[PDB]
Write an enzyme that holds these catalytic residues in place. Sequence first.
Site, mmCIF file in Angstrom:
data_model
loop_
_atom_site.group_PDB
_atom_site.id
_atom_site.type_symbol
_atom_site.label_atom_id
_atom_site.label_comp_id
_atom_site.label_asym_id
_atom_site.label_seq_id
_atom_site.Cartn_x
_atom_site.Cartn_y
_atom_site.Cartn_z
ATOM 1 N N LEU A 157 47.351 37.625 33.538
ATOM 2 C CA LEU A 157 46.646 38.663 32.763
ATOM 3 C C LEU A 157 46.341 39.907 33.601
ATOM 4 C CD1 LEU A 157 44.281 36.378 30.605
ATOM 5 C CD2 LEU A 157 46.324 37.662 29.868
ATOM 6 N N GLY A 181 43.668 41.511 41.441
ATOM 7 C CA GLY A 181 43.240 42.445 42.480
ATOM 8 C C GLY A 181 43.985 42.094 43.758
ATOM 9 N N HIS A 182 43.379 42.381 44.908
ATOM 10 C CA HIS A 182 43.984 42.022 46.196
ATOM 11 C C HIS A 182 43.610 40.632 46.650
ATOM 12 C CE1 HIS A 182 46.613 45.169 47.580
ATOM 13 N NE2 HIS A 182 45.713 46.136 47.335
ATOM 14 N N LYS A 204 42.922 36.864 40.989
ATOM 15 C CA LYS A 204 43.780 37.074 39.841
ATOM 16 C C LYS A 204 43.313 36.263 38.641
ATOM 17 C CE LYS A 204 47.928 35.692 39.568
ATOM 18 N NZ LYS A 204 49.363 35.318 39.724
ATOM 19 N N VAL A 205 43.690 36.730 37.460
ATOM 20 C CA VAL A 205 43.313 36.061 36.244
ATOM 21 C C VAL A 205 44.571 35.668 35.494
ATOM 22 C CG1 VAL A 205 42.117 36.274 34.032
ATOM 23 C CG2 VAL A 205 41.135 37.312 36.118
ATOM 24 N N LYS A 232 40.155 32.693 36.385
ATOM 25 C CA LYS A 232 40.104 33.516 37.593
ATOM 26 C C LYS A 232 40.111 32.653 38.857
ATOM 27 C CE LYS A 232 38.102 37.684 39.495
ATOM 28 N NZ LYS A 232 36.988 38.672 39.442
ATOM 29 N N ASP A 240 32.426 48.564 39.449
ATOM 30 C CA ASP A 240 33.837 48.576 39.056
ATOM 31 C C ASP A 240 34.033 48.888 37.571
ATOM 32 O OD1 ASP A 240 36.480 48.392 39.848
ATOM 33 O OD2 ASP A 240 36.654 46.248 39.351
HETATM 34 C C1 LIG Z 1 45.474 42.020 29.760
HETATM 35 C C2 LIG Z 1 44.274 42.074 30.708
HETATM 36 O O1 LIG Z 1 43.595 43.348 30.670
HETATM 37 C C3 LIG Z 1 43.272 41.011 30.342
HETATM 38 N N1 LIG Z 1 43.270 40.377 29.224
HETATM 39 C C4 LIG Z 1 42.248 39.499 29.188
HETATM 40 C C5 LIG Z 1 41.822 38.590 28.219
HETATM 41 N N2 LIG Z 1 40.776 37.818 28.412
HETATM 42 C C6 LIG Z 1 40.081 37.867 29.545
HETATM 43 N N3 LIG Z 1 38.993 37.167 29.964
HETATM 44 C C7 LIG Z 1 38.635 37.558 31.232
HETATM 45 C C8 LIG Z 1 39.468 38.529 31.645
HETATM 46 C C9 LIG Z 1 40.436 38.764 30.581
HETATM 47 C C10 LIG Z 1 41.555 39.615 30.409
HETATM 48 N N4 LIG Z 1 42.240 40.589 31.129
HETATM 49 C C11 LIG Z 1 41.971 41.133 32.476
HETATM 50 C C12 LIG Z 1 40.559 41.736 32.538
HETATM 51 C C13 LIG Z 1 40.311 42.340 33.933
HETATM 52 C C14 LIG Z 1 40.550 41.318 35.064
HETATM 53 C C15 LIG Z 1 40.365 42.083 36.390
HETATM 54 C C16 LIG Z 1 39.841 41.211 37.542
HETATM 55 C C17 LIG Z 1 40.932 40.439 38.154
HETATM 56 N N5 LIG Z 1 41.816 39.827 38.533
HETATM 57 C C18 LIG Z 1 41.958 40.704 34.958
HETATM 58 C C19 LIG Z 1 42.168 40.074 33.575
#
Ligand SMILES: C[C@@H](O)c1nc2cnc3[nH]ccc3c2n1[C@H]1CC[C@H](CCC#N)CC1
Length: 292
Positions: A29, A32-33, A36-37, A56, A141
């Site tokens: 999804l 960062g460095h 990751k998610v 995460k 952030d």
């Molecule tokens: C596609 C991307 O913007 C995204 N889609 C998500 C759907 N559900 C979510 N639930 C928690 C995060 C999350 C999601 N994130 C991103 C949001 C920002 C984070 C940034 C921090 C890191 N790695 C990555 C995932």
Amino acid sequence: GDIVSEKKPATEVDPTHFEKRFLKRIRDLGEGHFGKVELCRYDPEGDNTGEQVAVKSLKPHIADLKKEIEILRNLYHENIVKYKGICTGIKLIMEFLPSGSLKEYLPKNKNKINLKQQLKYAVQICKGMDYLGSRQYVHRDLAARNVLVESEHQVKIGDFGLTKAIETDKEYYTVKDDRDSPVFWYAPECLMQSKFYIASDVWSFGVTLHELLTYCDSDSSPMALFLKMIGPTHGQMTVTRLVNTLKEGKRLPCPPNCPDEVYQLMRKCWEFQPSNRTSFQNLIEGFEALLK
Ligand SMILES: C[C@@H](O)c1nc2cnc3[nH]ccc3c2n1[C@H]1CC[C@H](CCC#N)CC1
């Protein structure tokens, strides 16, 4: 006589404990460095019916992730992404929002999302941030990439990787690791002295509001626009160049089709001095006044 063994305690289930063997990775999804998610399905029945979750984890800082988990675990607000649990090394399990962040959703839904809906999102982001500030945290952030879309009518702050507690009776948190700061979202005090106030999040909110008003188009991003204003080829002098521009009084321009009254609320976020900035509660009042 017989082999002695331990009487087994009756084992209850913890609904916040996700077993590694059932947590199945679907795709990335974001990252960062250090973190990751990923989108996973937690599928204990093994038939692809389990619920989808955002996971995460660290990239191959454990202490920081555990602190992030403890922070999120205790936040309860409709505009803050829901903690679901952990998988234990450790992974943070959160709700998954299919629409993704404003960066994904806004470019695709311009026709559906008008100024009124943008203002309501603005209110929601402020309410989430004001809640965080009431828990004595600074987010550090706040950008559109960290604002998740729950539905056409609702957004949630969706990451807390840099969030820090402000000490009781103190007014700011001082930062040490700054190598990967989102400098084009940062207030002067953050850029110059590395101090972070709640007023510093108000500044970032201003920039996030700019992004929202530009539907997160990459050519109109705060970085693209700032690099235009100061020059895109200054390398390691970039931030000093940025700091000087802000000192002169230069700010991001009014987005196309953004009424001046909205732009004025945005400019109040960007008073050079932290003490002179608007608050989140006052922003809420302002937006609500424009919605009625
Ligand atoms: C596609 C991307 O913007 C995204 N889609 C998500 C759907 N559900 C979510 N639930 C928690 C995060 C999350 C999601 N994130 C991103 C949001 C920002 C984070 C940034 C921090 C890191 N790695 C990555 C995932």
